[PDB]
Write a protein that binds this ligand. Structure first.
Ligand SMILES: CCCCCCCCCCCCCCCCCC(=O)OC[C@H](CO[C@@H]1O[C@H](CO)[C@H](O)[C@H](O)[C@H]1O)OC(=O)CCCCCCCCCCCCCCCCC
Ligand SMILES: CCCCCCCCCCCCCCCCCC(=O)OC[C@H](CO[C@@H]1O[C@H](CO)[C@H](O)[C@H](O)[C@H]1O)OC(=O)CCCCCCCCCCCCCCCCC
Ligand SMILES: CCCCCCCCCCCCCCCC(=O)OC[C@H](CO[C@@H]1O[C@H](CS(=O)(=O)O)[C@@H](O)[C@H](O)[C@H]1O)OC(=O)CCCCCCCCCCCCCCC
Ligand SMILES: CCCCCCCCCCCCCCCC(=O)OC[C@H](COP(=O)(O)OC[C@@H](O)CO)OC(=O)CCCCCCCCCCCCCCC
Ligand SMILES: CCCCCCCCCCCCCCCC(=O)OC[C@H](COP(=O)(O)OC[C@@H](O)CO)OC(=O)CCCCCCCCCCCCCCC
Ligand SMILES: CCCCCCCCCCCCCCCC(=O)OC[C@H](COP(=O)(O)OC[C@@H](O)CO)OC(=O)CCCCCCCCCCCCCCC
Ligand SMILES: CCCCCCCCCCCCCCCC(=O)OC[C@H](COP(=O)(O)OC[C@@H](O)CO)OC(=O)CCCCCCCCCCCCCCC
Ligand SMILES: CC1=C(/C=C/C(C)=C/C=C/C(C)=C/C=C/C=C(C)/C=C/C=C(C)/C=C/C2=C(C)CCCC2(C)C)C(C)(C)CCC1
Ligand SMILES: CC1=C(/C=C/C(C)=C/C=C/C(C)=C/C=C\C=C(C)\C=C\C=C(C)\C=C\C2=C(C)CCCC2(C)C)C(C)(C)CCC1
Ligand SMILES: CCCCCCCCCCCCO[C@@H]1O[C@H](CO)[C@@H](O[C@H]2O[C@H](CO)[C@@H](O)[C@H](O)[C@H]2O)[C@H](O)[C@H]1O
Lengths: 41, 504, 44, 639
């Protein structure tokens, strides 16, 4: 049985850095193609 | 460290950081520093969650860990008692993960961004407060902490029947937390001590007749929160009229409290009443599965169909609770984590395709998959995860619930035969609706009445990142389940051994 | 009710009160029958 | 040996090909879709490593090396311990080499088939995902793993039928195939759970003999064991398209043709017979289960051979032919002929894969003439004289018709002869039926061959609507796998002859292991040549023309042409019934339960829109209420 703790400790800074990176990688909602305000009405 | 207050920081840091939301400077008004601040607070809180987990949580301890107990009000026994159990720590990790991904998925909002990210951080601190606290009055406090945040997230953003949905939600959930407080006060004033701590209340010896009444009150209060099909009609309104991040943490996490607490204070606290009510819970889980699969099939709305699927997937949680084996309880906790991941991916994708196509009706939105190919691919993958496909985390929990129920020798043989026969017709019924909606929403020739009016743009890299971050633990747990089961196999082994002492 | 009578789920006389009443007593009576049967057939 | 320790890399290495390329196709989708030939070379290279690991394991199993097993613990509890792993049996290595060779030749075929297609890279990612899931299916030691990789194979079947998602018929066919296979997975899961309940092993040899320990004792009545075994058999009913659950396989021809060769005629659809072979320790004790398996297979062979006659589509008739041949395999496995059924499984997947590859090259050369419309390019009544235009396709189709017809010493005579010989020794009532359908099989297959490759072109007269006006030859990538598959369609029938039967020594049943053969081998070959000469007289030489015969039995012709009215029946009872039941349960949910909820919220609103009239603006009424309260509280406080 392998442990979940080194896997989680090695995958969470990758998760944090890729969240902070992929925040800056949006190309539909910040353009004029999206006719909305985030609410679903 | 181990003396540092960990879970107090985990709970209170999103709330304290959400109090600094109106002081963030934002001249442009669209709310970009607010969304970056909320994403930073979510990532920092998830990093602290996993640091406390990988350092100060021991996987071979069935008792409570990360234990703090501060003295709030000694007059009434109100203590700030937090702790991380095996029933709590996968749900705490899942709450951090799904709430950070929901904050990241909440990025198209520009209506009231300060209030939105304040409410999302005040739900981040307050969702973990349900799974973390060990005091019953603080459990009622953290349970009712999501009354006004989910009301305002429902009623301001998302849906056309959103006001009736938010009204029915807040009245229904308040009328059930009524029974939360009633049952907690009843079982804490039993005997000659007024200890409100959940371990001490599990350590008492209540007589039957009292246990049946407290179980009936807890069963009303949790059969509202966990969708049990007589008491489930708050959910299709409150979830078919919600935005995708709100729906993500609304049926990814908030359905799991009430189902976490079905183990904590109905099985671990009242086992003599659980042994009386468990056939009813098994049948209500079976009816959850079949009933909500049929109402998922008959829904022509998209969000209400996925909401009813979220009702359908907790019947296996109920069957795993009321089965008296270690594998049944382990499959129930595995389903309440796997459905959180799978469902949150489905709600995010449904919100994405509604933000593109501007319609929820399956009679519109014809060949949409010709233009958004990545949303089609991700939606097919997460819909396949919902179908209990092996190699993904939805199959393992359902298989463990089936095996752990059928091998449970506490029940009679025709009962187990009829139930595992009836729990398995959802195995047919879930591909029926979840592939008819794929066939009706993405497949076929392109609906030219729709593409003339809306810009059918493909997925952003952020959306592909969110669905990949949801699908990595789904496949990683469906391929190797002992990644997750090793977090809670001790505590559940403590629970079932505590609950098998009542059966003949 | 009329929002459910469109497309694939399109049946004449489905949202009628007689059909809703007979389907309600059928569905909820099988619920009550399964619950009473579970309390009687299953032991503990 | 490191090749037996690392045999788990045989399913994992194509999965990496699905993992890399698919991640290249969801992240860098603008780049990987232009990487057609390097992606095809990558996927074919990983499967060429697998075909050569499986070849070496197969030849090590031929030369001894008693069966290997490496298990791992997958899902643990108190005392249940669900385990996974791999096993290298003779049958496991035989299925390994079958799946790897057919998948390699199908990918080399699809290199030329999907060349004028935008979905080239997604097709190869899907084919590597299917190769992974099937190679994990054939090495599976437990029953729980022949649900895991079983349902994964069903998933990628649904993914591959709905490959052209712009079509509507392909969409409905993919959904129907997943749901109809899931009608059998319901029941495979039921019998699997009930056999872990009764036995408690999740192992084929474990619940082979622990079931005998149970049922010979007073525990576990044989009707319950028969119910569990028929439930387990319901999986192979859906997967191999047996009699109730066969309606998904002819619709599954709405996908591409390399998958209708690989996944729908060769490899997945011959895995329910693999599951019957693996559960043969459990099926061998129950005679009612064996009898219903054999009669389901015999009636499926008869039904498929009946429907395949009147189908004018080159792929629907071939789908009904493989339904018939899988009925032959299931009937062979039902009469206790383990080795004969698996020998017909090995004999199949080599000519039927070749028949479908030849059908795909016919459709590809017709699409350059009559257009990309599937209703025109696949109709056999517009094909005619393809042999002088397609010589190598016509040759590798003429073999394959000869193989499935059972006429020459090619592979397909020995296998069907062994099945019918073991059926005649066990049940002579179904030998007559399946011998008549062997005659019908030769008839419809050479009807296919004579309507496709003899005569002249005979196009659609009034329209074409967009290399043309003559069938060209499909390229070397679409004809070299045909010639490679032609070698086992002729030669490896010799390994299972009644003299020196190497297949019965290699693949024997687990646990305890002429003067009539020429009579049955004269009878089957005689009915084959009678079917062939009837097809030659009807479709090539005129005078019994198939319109006068089709008007003489016109009710039976309309019965066989409308595929026994099964789908319409399934659109009457089951589809419309499930929609009506779903609509009724949703009407109950929206009306009754929400009526209780909204009525609770309503009768608390009209008691306060009607309790406010108690406060009506008159002060003297208020003091009257005060004094009435004084009187009432004195009266009620004194008794
Ligand atoms: C294990 C569980 C595995 C679940 C796998 C489910 C795969 C779902 C994706 C299929 C739907 C895609 C779709 O319909 O096409 C929708 C689109 C079709 O887009 C195609 O690709 C290009 C995009 O420009 C070109 O346009 C092609 O012409 C177009 O056909 O698909 C994609 O864009 C992405 C397809 C990715 C398919 C990868 C399959 C292999 C993944 C298996 C990896 C799992 C490994 C687990 C370990
Ligand atoms: C349960 C009861 C089971 C009853 C089974 C019903 C049998 C249905 C009859 C199937 C035969 C059929 O319809 O053939 C009907 C076919 C009709 O033939 C088709 O006709 C079409 C035009 O109508 C086109 O010409 C097609 O090319 C031609 O195949 O007739 C024959 O080919 C019969 C020949 C039988 C040869 C037997 C081979 C010798 C053994
Ligand atoms: C199981 C026990 C759990 C609960 C126990 C305690 C009960 C709590 C009672 C609280 C209700 C009192 C508040 C006043 C209600 C009101 O004003 O109406 C508000 C709306 C109507 O106004 C609507 O309101 C909307 C907006 S509004 O303010 O007008 O904004 C408007 O858009 C809409 O048109 C309008 O119609 O009605 C509701 O939505 C009330 C829903 C509250 C449900 C209470 C629990 C019901 C349990 C039923 C169990 C069913 C199981 C049986 C199945 C066989
Ligand atoms: C946990 C506590 C949850 C309580 C939930 C109640 C929320 C009530 C919201 C009322 C409206 C807020 C006024 C709005 C306001 O005053 O600020 C004004 C500011 C406006 O920003 P907006 O981006 O929304 O402006 C856009 C609009 O002008 C139109 O688009 O809103 C905020 O910054 C977020 C509000 C958070 C402030 C709530 C603080 C609650 C403190 C209570 C906690 C007690 C703990 C001890
Ligand atoms: C050793 C242990 C540590 C490593 C373990 C983890 C390894 C991860 C390696 C893969 C990540 C690298 C991604 C490169 C991706 C990259 O560099 O950018 C790829 C690309 C870059 O943006 P573009 O604007 O160029 O997109 C192309 C445009 O033209 C399309 O509009 O973005 C995408 O297209 C979407 C990709 C989504 C991919 C999702 C990210 C991967 C999922 C991560 C899952 C983490 C789960 C954590 C759960 C706790
Ligand atoms: C496709 C499904 C998803 C991937 C499943 C396979 C994941 C990788 C398998 C585990 C790698 C273990 C690395 C140890 C290296 C290794 O594998 O060597 C084989 C290993 C024994 O290694 P030893 O070092 O003990 O060598 C034997 C001694 O005689 C010499 O030291 O056996 C196992 O650990 C059990 C593996 C069963 C795994 C079967 C899983 C089912 C696969 C699907 C069929
Ligand atoms: C004898 C049974 C063996 C034959 C079963 C063939 C089913 C094949 C379905 C293919 C049709 C198909 O796959 O299309 C999917 C179909 C739903 O239709 P859709 O609207 O999703 O799609 C349109 C279809 O025309 C094709 O896509 O699902 C079903 O109706 C399956 C019905 C349950 C399967 C049968 C269960 C039998 C249970 C017997 C008891 C009835 C329940 C009583 C409840 C009160
Ligand atoms: C013919 C036969 C065959 C078989 C086949 C199979 C495939 C069939 C199966 C079938 C199956 C597939 C069955 C199933 C059934 C199920 C049913 C029995 C159902 C029931 C359900 C219940 C009744 C429900 C209820 C619900 C509703 C009503 C509503 C909501 C709520 C509730 C939950 C109450 C074989 C091969 C052997 C051969 C011989 C002959
Ligand atoms: C956080 C949290 C935690 C942890 C987790 C972890 C532990 C995970 C694992 C993981 C593992 C260690 C991994 C393994 C494997 C991975 C896989 C292998 C992946 C895959 C991916 C794929 C490749 C995809 C693809 C794509 C997508 C992106 C979309 C759609 C389309 C497609 C499908 C194509 C817990 C416990 C509490 C649970 C919950 C969550
Ligand atoms: C310190 C102990 C006491 C704690 C008291 C709790 C309240 C804390 C101080 C709040 C008062 C200062 O409040 C300050 O000024 C105003 C209130 O008019 C608001 O200022 C705000 O102005 C407008 C909206 O009105 C926004 O565009 C701007 O971004 C924001 O700064 C903020 O709230 C804060 O910038």
């Amino acid at each position: 049985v392998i442990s979940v703790k080194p896997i989680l400790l090695a995958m969470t800074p990758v998760f944090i850095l890729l969240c902070l990176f992929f925040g800056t990688r949006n190309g539909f909602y910040d353009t004029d193609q999206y006719h909305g305000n985030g609410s679903a009405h | 460290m181990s003396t540092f207050p960990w879970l107090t920081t985990i709970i209170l840091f999103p709330i304290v950081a959400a109090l600094a939301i109106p002081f963030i400077p934002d001249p442009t008004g669209k709310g970009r520093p607010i969304r970056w601040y909320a994403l930073a607070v979510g990532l920092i809180d998830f990093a602290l969650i996993v640091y406390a987990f990988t350092n100060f949580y021991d996987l071979n301890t069935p008792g409570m860990q990360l234990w703090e107990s501060y003295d709030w009000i000694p007059e009434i026994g109100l203590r700030w008692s937090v702790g991380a159990d095996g029933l709590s720590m996968p749900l705490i990790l899942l709450t951090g993960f799904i709430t950070t991904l929901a904050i990241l998925a909440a990025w198209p909002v520009t209506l009231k961004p300060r209030l939105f990210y304040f409410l999302m951080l005040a739900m981040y601190g307050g969702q973990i407060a349900v799974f973390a606290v060990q005091d019953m009055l603080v459990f009622f406090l953290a349970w009712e902490l999501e009354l006004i945040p989910v009301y305002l997230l429902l009623a301001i953003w998302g849906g056309h029947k959103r006001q009736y949905a938010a009204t029915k939600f807040i009245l229904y959930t308040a009328g059930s937390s009524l029974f939360i407080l009633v049952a907690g006060l009843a079982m804490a004033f039993y005997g000659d001590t007024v200890s409100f701590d959940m371990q001490t209340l599990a350590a008492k010896d209540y007589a039957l007749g009292f246990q049946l009444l407290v179980y009936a009150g807890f069963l009303v209060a949790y059969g509202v929160k966990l969708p049990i099909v007589p008491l489930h009609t708050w959910l299709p309104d409150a979830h078919g009229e919600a935005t995708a991040p709100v729906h993500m943490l609304l049926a990814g996490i908030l359905l799991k409290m009430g189902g976490y607490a079905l183990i904590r204070m109905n099985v671990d606290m009242l086992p003599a009443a659980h042994a009386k009510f468990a056939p009813v819970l098994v049948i209500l889980g079976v009816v959850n599965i079949i009933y909500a699969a049929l109402t998922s099939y008959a829904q022509r709305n998209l969000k209400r169909k996925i909401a009813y699927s979220s009702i359908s997937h907790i019947g296996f949680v109920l069957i795993g609770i009321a089965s008296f084996t270690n594998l049944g309880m382990s499959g129930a906790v595995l389903q309440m984590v796997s459905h959180g991941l799978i469902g949150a991916s489905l709600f995010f994708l449904v919100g994405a395709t509604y933000d593109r196509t501007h319609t929820l009706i399956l009679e519109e939105m014809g060949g949409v998959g010709q233009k958004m190919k990545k949303i089609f691919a991700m939606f097919t993958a997460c819909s396949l995860a919902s179908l209990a496909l092996p190699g993904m985390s939805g199959f393992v929990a359902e298989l463990m619930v089936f095996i752990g129920f059928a091998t449970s020798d506490a029940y009679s043989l025709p009962f187990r035969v009829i139930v595992v026969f009836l729990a398995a017709v959802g195995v047919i019924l879930t591909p029926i609706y979840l592939l008819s909606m794929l066939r009706e929403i993405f497949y076929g020739p392109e609906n030219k009445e729709l593409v003339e009016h809306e810009a059918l743009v493909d997925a952003e890299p952020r959306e592909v990142f969110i669905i990949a971050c949801l699908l990595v633990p789904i496949i990683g747990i469906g391929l190797y389940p002992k990644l997750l089961t090793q977090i809670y196999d001790a505590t559940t082994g403590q629970v079932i051994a505590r609950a098998r002492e009542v059966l003949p | 009710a009329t929002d459910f009578n469109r497309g694939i789920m399109k049946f004449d006389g489905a949202d009628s009160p007689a059909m809703i009443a007979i389907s309600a007593v059928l569905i909820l009576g099988f619920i009550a029958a399964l619950i009473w049967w579970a309390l009687h057939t299953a032991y503990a | 040996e490191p090749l037996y320790q690392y045999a788990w890399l045989i399913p994992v290495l194509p999965l990496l090909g699905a993992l890399i390329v698919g991640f290249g196709l969801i992240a860098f989708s603008e780049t990987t879709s232009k990487l057609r030939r390097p992606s095809a070379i990558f996927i074919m290279a990983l499967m060429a490593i697998a075909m050569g690991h499986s070849l070496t394991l197969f030849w090590s199993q031929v030369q001894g090396h008693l069966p290997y097993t490496q298990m791992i613990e997958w899902a643990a509890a108190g005392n249940l311990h669900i385990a996974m792993g791999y096993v290298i049996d003779p049958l496991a290595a035989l299925m390994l080499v079958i799946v790897t060779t057919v998948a390699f030749l199908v990918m080399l075929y699809s290199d030329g088939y999907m060349a004028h297609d935008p979905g080239y890279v997604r097709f190869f990612a899907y084919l590597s995902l299917f190769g992974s899931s099937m190679l994990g299916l054939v090495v599976s030691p437990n029953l729980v793993q022949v649900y895991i990789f079983w349902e994964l194979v069903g998933m990628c079947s649904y993914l591959l039928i709905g490959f052209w998602y712009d079509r509507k018929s392909a969409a409905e066919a993919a959904q129907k195939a997943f749901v109809t296979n899931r009608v059998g997975d319901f029941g495979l899961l039921l019998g699997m759970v009930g056999l872990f309940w009764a036995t408690g092993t999740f192992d084929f040899a474990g619940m082979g003999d622990r079931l005998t320990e149970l049922v010979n004792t007073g525990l576990l009545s044989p009707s319950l064991a028969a119910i569990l075994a028929i439930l387990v058999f319901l999986g192979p009913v859906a997967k191999s398209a047996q009699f109730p659950l066969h309606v998904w396989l002819p619709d599954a021809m709405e996908g591409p043709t390399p998958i209708s060769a690989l996944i729908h005629a060769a490899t997945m659809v011959a895995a329910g017979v693999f599951l019957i072979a693996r559960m043969f320790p459990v099926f061998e004790q129950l005679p009612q289960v064996m009898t219903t398996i054999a009669w389901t297979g015999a009636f499926t062979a008869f039904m498929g051979a009946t429907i395949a006659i009147t189908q004018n589509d080159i792929k629907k008739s071939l789908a009904y032919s493989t339904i018939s041949q899988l009925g032959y395999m299931v009937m062979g496995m039902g009469v206790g002929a383990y080795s004969a059924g698996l020998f017909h499984l090995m004999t199949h997947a080599y000519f039927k894969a070749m028949l479908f590859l030849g059908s795909g090259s016919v459709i590809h050369s017709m699409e350059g003439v009559v257009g990309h419309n599937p209703d025109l390019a696949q109709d056999m009544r517009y094909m005619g004289g393809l042999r002088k235009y397609m010589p190598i396709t016509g040759a590798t189709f003429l073999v394959g018709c000869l193989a499935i017809s059972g006429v020459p010493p090619f592979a397909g005579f020995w296998s069907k002869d062994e099945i019918l010989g073991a059926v005649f020794h066990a049940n002579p009532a179904m030998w007559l039926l399946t011998w008549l359908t062997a005659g019908l099989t030769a008839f419809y297959m050479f009807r296919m061959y004579f309507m496709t490759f003899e005569g002249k072109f005979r196009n659609v007269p009034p329209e074409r609507q967009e290399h043309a006006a003559v069938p060209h030859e499909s390229p070397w990538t679409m004809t070299l796998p045909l010639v490679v598959l032609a070698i086992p369609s002729t030669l490896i029938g010799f390994v299972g002859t009644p003299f020196n039967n190497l297949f019965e020594v290699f693949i024997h049943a687990p646990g305890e292991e002429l003067t009539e053969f020429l009579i049955l081998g004269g009878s089957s070959v005689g009915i084959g040549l009678m079917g062939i000469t009837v097809a030659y007289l009807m479709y090539l030489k005129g005078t019994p023309s198939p319109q006068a015969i089709a008007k003489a039995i016109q009710p039976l012709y309309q019965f066989s042409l409308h595929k026994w009215y099964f789908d319409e029946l399934y659109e009457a009872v089951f589809i419309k019934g499930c929609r009506r039941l779903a609509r009724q349960v949703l009407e109950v949910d929206y009306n009754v339960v929400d009526g209780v909820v909204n009525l609770t919220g309503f009768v608390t609103m009209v008691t306060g829109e009607g309790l406010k009239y108690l406060q009506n603006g008159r002060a003297q009424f208020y003091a009257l209420i005060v004094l009435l309260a004084v009187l009432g509280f004195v009266i009620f406080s004194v008794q």
